[PDB]
Design a protein around this ligand. Structure first.
Ligand code: UQ1
Lengths: 134, 188
């Protein structure tokens, strides 16, 4: 697993990053949340259970549970609301961590200086990630 | 028994006193903002649930729109001072969002003119000191109950509001629920 995800992660980790700053500085809230369903699952899936040693690949299967699990609906909701709004939602420009996980939006949102693809690839990097491992 | 922190409202951690009797931020930019007030007529409903003379209060907020973001607030400012909120509320909403016709201070200017506002009396209370002041009061209540986005209610500067701890398939119901929640919280 390691390299196939680390070769495709970086290229999307960075295809975000590379151009994050070159795309000037677009306004975005669900991004960090969605960049945390990435960099909180890939960056902890290589190093998840496929791991430094390869005989215990079910801890990732549980990080691959609360992974694009969210990563799906985060971008799935995100998209839904663009043309199909709601009274009950919001629209913001802010941090948050309900248990002090703070540095996470004073660095990956701080050091930042289309959804079409996100909505689908987050579900696409799921069923493929599900089938062959479950 | 059946009214819970974390559920229908989330209690404010850092309570601000000197607050309204119920604030209600919003932007002329957030569809959800629109929906909340144009598609559901929520304030009106909630007003009707409120007791004797509990100041329903409302503001507008900046972050979305930047340059116009501002103008709009002072657009509103006036509209608090004069009287007008009720009469500009919709046009402007429709103006910015739906009809896609607002662009500059002047475009807004005119939208007051039309609804029975005098092109000077507006500019005659635009720059006034009792509307530079109101403009702060807005940013300052907003930095003070730690707003991140919009819509958003707040009672007594002590309990935010939480729509998710409620139904979200039945509009008729989501409403009757929402309003109660504010009533209950107005006496606490
Ligand atoms: C995966 O989550 C998201 C991104 O990362 C690839 C984005 O770049 C963007 C757009 C980028 C900027 C700088 C607004 C959005 C909206 C997003 O939700």
């Amino acid at each position: 697993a390691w390299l196939l995800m680390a070769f495709t992660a970086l290229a999307l980790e960075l295809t975000a990053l590379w151009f994050q700053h070159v795309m000037l500085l677009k306004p975005c809230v669900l991004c960090i949340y969605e960049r945390v369903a990435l960099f909180g699952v890939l960056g902890a899936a290589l190093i998840g259970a496929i791991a430094p040693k390869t005989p215990l690949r079910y801890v990732a299967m549980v990080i691959w549970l609360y992974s694009a699990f969210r990563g799906v609906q985060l971008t799935y909701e995100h998209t839904m609301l663009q043309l199909y709004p709601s009274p009950f939602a919001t629209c913001d420009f802010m941090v948050r961590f309900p248990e002090w996980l703070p540095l996470d939006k004073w660095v990956p949102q701080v050091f930042v200086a289309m959804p079409q693809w996100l909505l689908g690839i987050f579900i696409a990097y799921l069923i493929v990630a599900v089938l062959v491992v479950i | 028994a059946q009214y819970e922190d974390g559920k229908q409202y989330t209690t404010l951690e850092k309570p601000v006193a000197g607050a309204p009797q119920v604030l209600e931020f919003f932007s002329f930019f957030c569809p959800h903002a629109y929906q909340f007030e144009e598609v559901l007529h929520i304030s009106d409903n909630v007003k009707k649930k409120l007791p004797e003379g509990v100041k329903m209060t409302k503001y507008h907020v900046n972050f979305m729109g930047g340059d116009l973001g501002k103008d709009l607030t002072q657009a509103w400012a006036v509209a608090m001072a004069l009287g007008v909120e009720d009469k500009v509320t919709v046009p402007l909403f429709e103006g910015v969002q739906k009809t896609q016709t607002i662009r500059s201070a002047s475009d807004i200017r005119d939208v007051f003119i039309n609804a029975g506002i005098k092109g000077e009396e507006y500019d005659a209370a635009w720059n006034s000191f009792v509307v530079k002041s109101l403009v702060a009061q807005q940013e300052k209540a907003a930095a003070d109950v730690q707003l991140r986005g919009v819509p958003a209610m707040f009672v007594n500067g002590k309990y935010q509001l939480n729509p998710q701890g409620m139904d979200t398939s039945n509009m008729d119901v989501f409403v009757q629920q929402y309003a109660d929640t504010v009533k209950y919280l107005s006496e606490k």
